[PDB]
Ligand SMILES: COc1ccc(C(=O)Oc2c(Br)cc(Br)cc2CNC(=O)c2ccccc2[N+](=O)[O-])cc1
């Protein structure tokens with residue numbers, strides 16, 4: 001894990017982060033961090049390899065206000081898994097459908113809360129054939145991801 | 161199961177459960193301390209564990225919260241600090257050692273609502289190399305435990 005802090009700068013950190021993620025089995029990741037008491041996303045540090053069209057669609061649709069993982073992150077340090085039960089309203093369900101259409105079906109979101117009030121999320125999606133396989137996979141990797149998120153937060157807050 | 165923390169009733173039961181989970185991971189002495197957001201003193205701290213009373217009393221009376229290097233580390237990072245040796249810092253390590261607390265680590269706690277604290281755990285060992293091997297062997301499980309303790313503990317201390 002210390003290779004993240006020991007990376008040279010943004011590009012090497014992003015690739016190392018995305019590579020640790022792929023080695024664990026997640027082809028898609030997004031790390032997002034805001035400074036303490038941020039009012040909007042003008043100063044957000046957001047990196048990863050989510051598809052561009054989905055990044056753009058989520059911004060244009062204002063999905064930070066509907067995505068249930070975002071409100072979760074304001075309330076907890078524990079992971080939220082992407083499962084049917086977290087999409088309660090129709091509007092959350094169609095967030096779910098559009099993420100799915102973009103290729104992001106199975107996954108989880110780890111909240112980020114830094115020592116200087118930084119607020120963020122590390123999200124990772126796994127390409128699996130059904131929820132049973134996705135869940136099995138995530139169990140096997142969860143303790144390692146649990147460390148990764150804090151090593152990512154501490155190093156990324158230093159970079160950002 | 162981490163679930164038994166969230167379902168406990170009252171600080172006695174919670175602290176017992178946490179102490180047992182730690183003991184199972186090889187740690188005989190632990191201290192969980194948590195302050196509300198932007199605390200200026202320790203008057204509203206929630207501190208539970210099985211550190212010895214004489215050591216707790218000494219640490220407070222001697223002002224060791226201003227000396228102990230783990231405390232400033234927690235204000236600056238989410239990553240753990242392993243216990244490894246200023247002249248007052250020299251005094252601090254000697255007196256901890258005299259109290260039986262020689263090897264261990266402190267896991268900083270940064271809550272979703274700005275709670276600040278630490279989960280400190282001591283391991284009994286023949287020497288530091290052996291202590292290190294004992295801690296490394298359980299570090300992924302401890303990493304999950306500290307965040308479960310923080311999420312449940314914040315509720316117990318400040319909300320329910
Ligand atoms: C206030 O502090 C914050 C808030 C938010 C983010 C943050 O990274 O949010 C974003 C952004 Br910005 C853009 C996209 Br595209 C996606 C997310 C997160 N959601 C999922 O991955 C997700 C979550 C559940 C299901 C599907 C997905 N998905 O996007 O495919 C960071 C810091």
Ligand SMILES: COc1ccc(C(=O)Oc2c(Br)cc(Br)cc2CNC(=O)c2ccccc2[N+](=O)[O-])cc1
Pocket residue numbers: 191192193194195207211215216219220225228230231234235243256261266276277278280281
């Ligand atoms: C940032 O908000 C905070 C700050 C601090 C604590 C916190 O719990 O601090 C305490 C207290 Br209060 C009493 C004692 Br006794 C010990 C500690 C911590 N140090 C060690 O365990 C230690 C650390 C290194 C080596 C040895 C030891 N040891 O005590 O044996 C909680 C919340």
